Write a protein that holds these residues in place. Sequence first.
Motif, PDB file in Angstrom:
ATOM      1  N   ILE A   1       2.003  -1.462  15.081  1.00  0.00           N
ATOM      2  CA  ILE A   1       1.135  -2.418  14.398  1.00  0.00           C
ATOM      3  C   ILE A   1       0.405  -3.285  15.415  1.00  0.00           C
TER       4      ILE A   1
ATOM      5  N   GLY B   1       4.224  -8.854   1.393  1.00  0.00           N
ATOM      6  CA  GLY B   1       3.377  -8.724   2.563  1.00  0.00           C
ATOM      7  C   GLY B   1       3.821  -7.649   3.533  1.00  0.00           C
ATOM      8  N   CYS B   2       4.410  -6.577   3.008  1.00  0.00           N
ATOM      9  CA  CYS B   2       4.851  -5.452   3.819  1.00  0.00           C
ATOM     10  C   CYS B   2       3.840  -4.310   3.843  1.00  0.00           C
ATOM     11  N   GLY B   3       2.631  -4.525   3.328  1.00  0.00           N
ATOM     12  CA  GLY B   3       1.602  -3.503   3.383  1.00  0.00           C
ATOM     13  C   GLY B   3       1.613  -2.541   2.214  1.00  0.00           C
ATOM     14  N   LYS B   4       1.460  -3.066   0.999  1.00  0.00           N
ATOM     15  CA  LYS B   4       1.471  -2.234  -0.199  1.00  0.00           C
ATOM     16  C   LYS B   4       0.075  -1.785  -0.622  1.00  0.00           C
ATOM     17  N   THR B   5      -0.909  -2.686  -0.589  1.00  0.00           N
ATOM     18  CA  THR B   5      -2.243  -2.342  -1.072  1.00  0.00           C
ATOM     19  C   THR B   5      -2.863  -1.214  -0.254  1.00  0.00           C
TER      20      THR B   5
ATOM     21  N   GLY C   1       2.572   1.572  10.835  1.00  0.00           N
ATOM     22  CA  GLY C   1       4.020   1.708  10.891  1.00  0.00           C
ATOM     23  C   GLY C   1       4.596   2.739   9.936  1.00  0.00           C
ATOM     24  N   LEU C   2       4.125   2.760   8.692  1.00  0.00           N
ATOM     25  CA  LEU C   2       4.777   3.537   7.636  1.00  0.00           C
ATOM     26  C   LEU C   2       4.270   4.975   7.687  1.00  0.00           C
TER      27      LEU C   2
ATOM     28  N   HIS D   1      -3.698  -3.339  15.872  1.00  0.00           N
ATOM     29  CA  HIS D   1      -4.444  -4.579  15.688  1.00  0.00           C
ATOM     30  C   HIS D   1      -5.072  -5.094  16.977  1.00  0.00           C
TER      31      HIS D   1
ATOM     32  N   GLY E   1      -5.572   3.305   9.577  1.00  0.00           N
ATOM     33  CA  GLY E   1      -5.269   2.101   8.825  1.00  0.00           C
ATOM     34  C   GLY E   1      -3.798   1.832   8.588  1.00  0.00           C
ATOM     35  N   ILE E   2      -2.984   2.884   8.595  1.00  0.00           N
ATOM     36  CA  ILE E   2      -1.610   2.761   8.118  1.00  0.00           C
ATOM     37  C   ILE E   2      -0.722   2.118   9.176  1.00  0.00           C
TER      38      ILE E   2
ATOM     39  N   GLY F   1       4.252  -7.777   8.330  1.00  0.00           N
ATOM     40  CA  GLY F   1       2.908  -7.334   8.637  1.00  0.00           C
ATOM     41  C   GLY F   1       1.935  -8.473   8.873  1.00  0.00           C
TER      42      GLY F   1
END
Lengths: 107, 529
Positions: B195, B52-56, B11-12, B199, B8-9, B227
């Motif tokens: 990413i 929108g950089c993928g925090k949740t 890039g980070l 996807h 799921g992650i 993202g």
Amino acid sequence: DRTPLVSVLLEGPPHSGKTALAAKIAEESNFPFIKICSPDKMIGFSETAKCQAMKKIFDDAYKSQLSCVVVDDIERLLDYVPIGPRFSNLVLQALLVLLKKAPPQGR
Amino acid sequence: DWNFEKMGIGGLDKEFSDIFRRAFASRVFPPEIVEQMGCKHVKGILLYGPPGCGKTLLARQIGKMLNAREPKVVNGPEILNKYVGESEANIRKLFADAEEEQRRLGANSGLHIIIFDEIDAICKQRGSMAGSTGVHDTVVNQLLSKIDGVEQLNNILVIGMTNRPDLIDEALLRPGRLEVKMEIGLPDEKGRLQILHIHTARMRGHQLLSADVDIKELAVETKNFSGAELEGLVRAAQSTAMNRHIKASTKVEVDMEKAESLQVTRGDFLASLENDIKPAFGTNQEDYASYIMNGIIKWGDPVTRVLDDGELLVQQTKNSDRTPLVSVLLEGPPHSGKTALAAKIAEESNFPFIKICSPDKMIGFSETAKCQAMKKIFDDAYKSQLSCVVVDDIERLLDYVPIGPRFSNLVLQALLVLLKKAPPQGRKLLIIGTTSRKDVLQEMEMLNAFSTTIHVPNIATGEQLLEALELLGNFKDKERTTIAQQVKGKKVWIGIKKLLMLIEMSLQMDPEYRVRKFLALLREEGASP
Ligand SMILES: Nc1ncnc2c1ncn2[C@@H]1O[C@H](COP(=O)(O)OP(=O)(O)OP(=O)(O)O)[C@@H](O)[C@H]1O
Ligand SMILES: Nc1ncnc2c1ncn2[C@@H]1O[C@H](COP(=O)(O)OP(=O)(O)OP(=O)(O)O)[C@@H](O)[C@H]1O
Ligand SMILES: Nc1ncnc2c1ncn2[C@@H]1O[C@H](COP(=O)(O)OP(=O)(O)O)[C@@H](O)[C@H]1O
């Protein structure tokens, strides 16, 4: 012992390098408490916000046994401009009142 | 050795190791030694970054790994009511499960995680800025009393998310409370590649994707995408490819073989990238056509001088240390055509982030809104390695009128302060101004802030006008000869925009009287500086 409060003012032509010297002299003291109140961290604030920030910083400084407070670019805080002239009276009054107030006994 | 990279992650990858070292060191060791020591665990962390950089996903994965129960998501603005003492009930209701488990199971209950969002919404610091948003400060205090106070909770973990890290109450960052900060910045080339790869796993399995498409080309082409933009591009490409295929099938009764095949091809990707998705942190090619309406024509030497000087400044700011901030100003008489040249020089930089802030989108706003917009634009620009901001008209922003004089002081102070604030370490910036009255501006003591000045002159010689007309190409041979004969006096002082308007005015009659009308109009505007 009989002079608990002291003041000193630095002045000169623009681009002479005043802030760096102020920072260096503040650092060299080795005091336990040091603080800087720059204007760039209050962008877009109103006069009431500035006076509240000054009051809070000075109140925090009051609680130590030795302290050093740096205020940078005084002319900019007042919102001065040669045309007019214009400025915020409240900030000037607050600063004048501060600059001659002694801390509680023994500090 | 973790394995999350591919599920799921994406890039980070480093942030996980960092947060694990900093925060969850206690919960990975055998319980015996830790209980012998008697130390406590961290009671929450904070995250901040772009929208929108993928925090949740970070919070959900962290909750999943720790073997915890279902997270209790919640939104910031939702927890707010106009009734007296009603927000506090909403705040209190969150912990009920934690209290019940603590009461019943004692010191052996599991872990419950509560995820706020836009936590900056509920805070009394926003009231400091110009406005009335005290939000009944009491609210925040209540929250503290649940993290710490007379009653002790030892089976909770609070993760906060924010977008404005400067609007967080200072009291909410002391030891024993949220006490670990981290940043989530934009991805890089490898991050974009990963990413896009993740996807695009679905279609590859079913051979639906065409073999023509590559992934490296798309990865490199997307410079400063975020993202959400990548998945938006994927969805738009799917939609456009399906639409093209169905329309082609409707037009032509192709054999079944191609009808079953729904290869998306590569043209759809390029078309969608160039037409649909508009990055918020990237160049906007559309706006450029709205300013440079008629291109650029070389009618004299000074244009080359200005372009060369701009290129020199761009080169100086690009690769240099000890000087991360650069300023420049343009001066000239009215109608000299300044904005176009500034836009051209900004465009030629090939920088990733270019923005234009003009009064165009700012009619009827109060001064406070103006300062807020300026601060927002500069804050956004701060979040890129290279940036270029254009200020359209300094005079109009200040609301200057010779009578009086009158103007707004707050905007002037804000601009002056901003022009002398370097970005965070290791990042560059460039600022370009424009004005039509340097005398007043110097009188206002701001000309000392800028670092350089350039001059844009007008047309002042007959042959220059002849060359400009020839390049534009609107007069015939004998017409040009007559104009040259009549203009040999050399007393010409006009601006380019006025010249275009006057040509348009003159070309509105029959061909016989064009020349005389144009000459009469030109002589009527007999300026003499
Ligand atoms: N001996 C020195 N005296 C002054 N500045 C020095 C000296 N040595 C190095 N510098 C450099 O000079 C610069 C001083 O900048 P500073 O902000 O203090 O200037 P200023 O003219 O007082 O600014 P302001 O615009 O706020 O009036 C810093 O880059 C500092 O590194
Ligand atoms: N070399 C050139 N120099 C100037 N303008 C040019 C040139 N080539 C074309 N133009 C056209 O001149 C016009 C320039 O308008 P612009 O907005 O720059 O005017 P301005 O005098 O800077 O305006 P203002 O001071 O009112 O904001 C545009 O139509 C542009 O297409
Ligand atoms: N590092 C990443 N890898 C894969 N997808 C991501 C990443 N970051 C964001 N996304 C995408 O963004 C979407 C979630 O956005 P989110 O971060 O929740 O926005 P917000 O922070 O505004 O709530 C998901 O659909 C996900 O596919």
